[PDB]
Structure formats: structure tokens, C-alpha cells
Chains A and B, each alone.
Chain A
Amino acid sequence: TVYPDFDIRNINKLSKKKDIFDILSQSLAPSIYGHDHIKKAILLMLMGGVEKNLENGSHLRGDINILMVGDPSTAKSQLLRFVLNTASLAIAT
């Protein structure tokens, strides 16, 4: 043979606050100081959009592609390693 309620209540309780967007953004990379605008983009990227599917068959994308261009070793090499351990499915290439 080959084999390939407590958590739900705590989610809806924290969602009632109006500051859940800044708290969850700073909790992704606590060791990386600053860069609050860059951490907010990784949050919406991991959640993903809505896969819009028409009736004729033409599907639309929903993923968010982020490109970082800057000086080497500026919260870029270490930032990519945190996303590989946070997401449930990630391939380091």
C-alpha cells in the first residue's frame, strides 16, 4: 500500500481589529529591521488573488509577481529564505 474548533475561533477573534494588516506584516521577518512597504507586498502575494474563470473557457491569472532590484545583500538574500519556510509549498531555485 502507498500512502501519499479552537484554531477557527482564534482566527475570527483577531480579525475584528482594524490593525491586522500591520501586525501580520511585521511578523513575517522580525529579524529584518525596517522595510515595512516591502513586507506588506509579500503578505498579499502569499494569500493570492481570485482565479477568475469565464464561461467560454478563457481563464485569468491571480498571482502577484514581485521583483526586487537593489544593492546586493540589502534585505533580499535573507528575505527569500523566510518565504521558503513560511509558505506550505515553495521551491528554492
Chain B
Amino acid sequence: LVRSLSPGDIVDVTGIFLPAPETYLEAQFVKFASFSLTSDVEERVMELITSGDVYNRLAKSIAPEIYGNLDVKKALLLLLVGGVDKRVGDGMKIRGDINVCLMGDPGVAKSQLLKAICKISPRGVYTTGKGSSGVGLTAAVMKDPVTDEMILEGGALVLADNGICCIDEFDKMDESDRTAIHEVMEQQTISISKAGINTTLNARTSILAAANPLYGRYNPRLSPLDNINLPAALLSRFDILFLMLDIPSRDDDEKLAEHVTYVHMHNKQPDLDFTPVEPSKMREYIAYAKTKRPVMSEAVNDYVVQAYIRLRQDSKREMD
């Protein structure tokens, strides 16, 4: 059974507790792919499919204390599932993760949306920007107090493998903290070369950052690239770039104030047109959909090419 325990796995080690005249454990017997296809779990998944409108039900069940932002909550549902990891036989590994970044004025409940997706995902790690520097984000090369060996302690991008990485305050980060981010969004790897350890660790996480303007509020008179202290190279790697602007409106503020008072009174969500999905059953539907690998159709390939031409022509005319 030796040479079979990988660092970072969650297994059930079975053994005996024998003391040493120090207490050791003599090994006797030793993620999304570990959940078995139980008949009781499969019955709960089919109950949501026969109900109808599964895409709109799960999009509104997330964050019950946040009213509005129907389009913003739709992108968070696909982040828990994601695309397929088509591995080319030549040696190319196409990244199937989605890179979504939330922007706007700090008042659209940005901290609540990052913590809501962390508790739902089984392997999600929430962190900030200034509190976690380049050592806490990548990997800390500490010294072992027993064997005196330089190990590699997992940080935020290592322990959250095959999950969603929640990063808060993306604009207040340093220049040395964006080094490993450029490698995860391209090759899903972390290049470490400290203390004579030149190893590469895989990081297949879903980066969900939340940028903030430099002048607090957004300025429509200035360019979108100058208002946010972020280069154009990082915006090209992000798939979706939202911008929740806090526009003052008498109709939106009236519906938002009534939803807040109802939460702080009954400790629940207002009664809508459907029953809220518990987080215990939502994890079973996401893990079941990850095993299914959809294949792109041939008739839909012509619509993707035609959509890229119209999108590139509109962006070229809006350069000035």
C-alpha cells in the first residue's frame, strides 16, 4: 500500500492506534468523482427535472437575501458546473473553466455574492487581496520541525483545486500577487522556484474576483479602462466582465427596501412562485451534470463564426 497516498486527497485511512515509547497509526487499508451513483441520490435529481424550468429555478435560488441582478446570478450558476476539459491527443489541454469578474460601485452586495458561492461549492476558498500576499496565495515554503525538510504548504490557489476561488478586492492587490493569476487563467499551473524547489503545481480553480473603482464611484465621463486600475491583458482572459452600476431609482429602491425588511423579520425569503432549493440538494445536481460531457453540433458551428464577425466589427468601430 506504500507509494499510493497523494498530498491533498481526502480518503478514509483505516488502521490501529499503537503508541511508540509519540503516537503513530499503522496503515492497514486506504472530490466530484468520489460521489457514487446512489439510487437515493438519483431519485432527488429527477424530481427537479420533471418540475420544469430548471435553469431559471437554480438561478433564483442562489443568494436569497439579494434582490435583483437576474443576469448576474445566471453567470454564477454556470461557474459551479463549467465546461468540458477537452484533452487533445497531441498534448494540448483546453481549459474548461469560466473566468467571471464582477465590477461596479461597492454597494451591489459584492461581499455577499462571493461568500454565497463559497459555501455551495465543496472546494471553495474565500480570500481578500491585501490580507493574502504572494506567499499566502501561491505556496509557503516552510521548514519541517521534525524531518527538517522543506515542504510546500498549500495556500489559496492550491487547496481550492477543482473548485471556485473567491478573491475579494482585486483592484487593491499588489504587483507581485498577479504573477500566479496569469498562469492559472492560461495553463492552470503555478510555477514555484523558491528554496531550490523548481516544481509546478496544478491549479484548476475558478477565479471569481471583484474589482472596485479607484475614485469610489464610477465616472461616466472617463474611459472604462482608466476608471479601473487593471491592465487590458487581464480583461482579455476574463470571459464575462459585469458592471453593476448603482443607478439611483425610485422603483428599484422601493422594491429593495421591502426585501431587506422581510429578511430581518422572518429570517427567511419572501414567498415567490417557486420553492427555494436547499444547498444540500444543489450539490447533487451540479456533481451529476459534471459527468455528462456535451458535444458541439455541426449545424451550430456556423452561428458561432457569424457571431464572432459581428462582435469584432462593433468593437472596431467603437475604438475612438
Q: Which residues of A contact B (CB under 8 A)?
A: 50, 52-58, 60
In the complex the two chains form, is B276's CB within 8 Å of A50's CB?
no
Q: Which residues of B contact A (CB under 8 A)?
A: 63-65, 112, 115-116, 119, 263-264, 267-269, 276, 278-279
* A49-B263 Cα distance, complex, nearest whole Å: 14
In the complex the two chains form, is A58's CB within 8 Å of B65's CB?
yes
In the complex the two chains form, is B276's CB within 8 Å of A56's CB?
yes
CB contact between A60 and one of B116, B119, B264, B279 (< 8 Å): that residue:
B264
B151: min CB distance to chain A, Å = 34
Q: Which residues of A contact B278 (CB under 8 A)?
A: 55-56
* A54-B262 Cα distance, complex, nearest whole Å: 12
- CB nearest to B268 among chain A residues: A55
In the complex the two chains form, is B268's CB within 8 Å of A58's CB?
no
In the complex the two chains form, is B267's CB within 8 Å of A56's CB?
no
In the complex the two chains form, is A60's CB within 8 Å of B65's CB?
yes
Q: Contacts A57-B119, A58-B119, A60-B65 given; indicate if A52 touches B279 (C-beta within 8 A).
A: no
In the complex the two chains form, is A58's CB within 8 Å of B267's CB?
no
Q: Which residues of A contact B279 (CB under 8 A)?
A: 56-57
In the complex the two chains form, is B263's CB within 8 Å of A54's CB?
yes
- CB nearest to A51 among chain B residues: B267
* A50-B119 Cα distance, complex, nearest whole Å: 22
B263: min CB distance to chain A, Å = 7
A63: min CB distance to chain B, Å = 14
